[PDB]
């Protein structure tokens, strides 16, 4: 599958002095069991139970499993899996989770042929990313995703139909975040660009609807903020 260059989305590496290993058969079964049985109710017990088998050397393997096999295909369980991560109390585990999510998205958004992109996987990974970053008052770093520059570029490369739904899915998760909801200036500035595109891009209705729906989750409308002026 042919890829295209993605100028403003980059995957970095997780800073870690610890050799990261594939988990051994016994560890797997112990973990899958916790994941499979954990509910909002048995959360803190299933977690300490999970700690006794999940040591920092297995964090990368856990992240790779949970994001690629669970978050990408189980949107109904994002809140649960997100709480497990928080429950674990490890900043390192969180970085692996974010990193693997960026890997998955990078591949999707890079795919030259739109038809070959699973929009469901794309939407789930975008929403999952917002779930474990913005919704938790944690930022998405500019060196990983430059949103405004991504949108401007998607506009001249005619990639909006892919990039917009991705952006709006992530930003939605800021709606209950105390730091990232409007008037957060980072969030507002992306909204202003979405509002500009909505007026000038002459794009299709589903995109107009996407932006209106995002604004509504912040209780705003396309008239609540002045559009930026990046687009000619």
């Amino acid at each position: 599958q042919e890829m295209i260059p993605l100028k403003f989305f980059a995957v970095d590496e997780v800073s870690c002095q610890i050799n990261q290993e594939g988990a051994p058969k016994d560890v797997v079964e112990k973990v899958l069991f916790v994941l499979n049985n954990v509910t909002l109710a048995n959360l803190n017990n299933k977690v300490d139970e999970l700690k006794k088998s999940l040591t920092p050397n297995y964090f990368s393997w856990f992240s790779t499993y949970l994001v690629t096999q669970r978050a990408k295909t189980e949107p109904n369980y994002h809140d649960l899996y997100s709480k497990v991560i928080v429950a674990m109390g490890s900043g390192l585990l969180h970085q692996f989770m974010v990193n693997v999510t960026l890997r998955q998205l990078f591949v999707l958004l890079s795919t030259k042929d739109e038809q070959a992109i699973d929009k469901k996987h794309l939407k789930n990974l975008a929403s999952w990313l917002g779930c474990i970053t913005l919704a938790l008052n944690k930022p998405i770093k500019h060196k990983n995703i430059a949103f405004r520059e991504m949108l401007i570029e998607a506009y001249k490369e005619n990639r909006l139909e892919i990039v917009v739904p991705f952006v709006t899915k992530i930003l939605q998760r800021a709606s209950e975040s105390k730091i990232f909801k409007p008037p957060n200036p980072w969030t507002v500035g992306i909204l202003k660009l979405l509002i500009e595109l909505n007026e000038k891009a002459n794009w299709k209705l589903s995109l107009t609807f996407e932006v209106e729906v995002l604004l509504k989750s912040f209780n705003l409308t396309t008239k609540s903020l002045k559009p930026s002026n990046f687009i000619n």
Binding site: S15, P139, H142, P185
Partner: protein, 252 residues
């Protein structure tokens, strides 16, 4: 005595034209050079239960406009990159049309800030996702910080200051989950021997009164050199073996 290498003594002025290229530089540096100091400077003059102190900062920060903001970056040991700047002085837009007191009425090039100054809203977007905020692997260094954090948090919130001290503290801890007020640390150190000003601090460490330090950019440089030197001497410990971390997140 303390003699920082010549090349560290350099402050890069930032105006609208280089705001973005300078943030690109700051983003590359933050993983390794993860101690960041801040200094600010505002236009007018502050206006007329340590809830009296908070309530006045609240009203003032809401009203007043920061005119310069200084950031300096080093690692935990005060090491800085050997190429390019590692101290910046962000110079903010100034609008005499809205400023109450006339420029003629009671250090700064007001004309230049007017024509070339940074839009505070653009600044706050680049800071939000720069790597500096909401990350306890980054260490913030302040000095007599209430007003500096006040102004910085107000810029990041893009909203009215919080009603009360407790709410304000909640916000600071979220944006800056790992920070020290060097004023407090130094005062606690002097009390294991019983002024506290930064210059007095700097002299006590045998640091020459370089001219570079007089500006806003220069003052964030000075507090960062000092915090790091001071921390190296004692291994981040007070005279009684207690760690400085005891006072992480406390202001004044």
């Amino acid at each position: 005595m303390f003699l920082p290498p010549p090349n560290y003594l350099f402050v890069r002025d930032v105006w609208k034209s280089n705001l973005y290229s300078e943030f690109a530089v700051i983003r590359q540096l933050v993983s390794q050079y993860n101690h960041v100091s801040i200094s600010t400077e505002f236009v007018g003059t502050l206006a007329r239960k340590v809830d009296y102190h908070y309530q006045t900062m609240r009203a003032n920060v809401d009203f007043l406009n920061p005119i310069q903001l200084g950031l300096s970056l080093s690692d935990a040991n005060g090491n800085k990159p050997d190429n390019g700047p590692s101290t910046w002085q962000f110079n903010f837009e100034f609008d005499p049309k809205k400023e109450i007191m006339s420029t003629e009425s009671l250090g700064i090039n007001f004309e230049k800030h007017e024509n070339l100054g940074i839009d505070v809203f653009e600044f706050s977007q680049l800071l939000m996702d720069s790597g500096l905020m909401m990350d306890d692997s980054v260490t913030w260094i302040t000095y007599h910080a209430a007003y500096d954090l006040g102004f910085l948090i107000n810029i990041l919130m893009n909203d009215s200051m919080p009603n009360n001290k407790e709410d304000f503290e909640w916000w600071v801890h979220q944006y800056m989950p790992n920070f020290y007020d060097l004023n407090l640390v130094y005062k606690i150190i002097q009390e294991f021997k019983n002024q506290y000003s930064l210059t007095t601090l700097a002299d006590e460490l045998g640091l020459p009164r370089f001219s570079i330090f007089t500006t806003t950019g220069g003052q964030s440089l000075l507090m960062l050199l000092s915090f790091c030197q001071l921390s190296k001497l004692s291994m981040h410990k007070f005279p009684n073996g207690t760690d400085f971390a005891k006072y992480q997140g406390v202001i004044y």
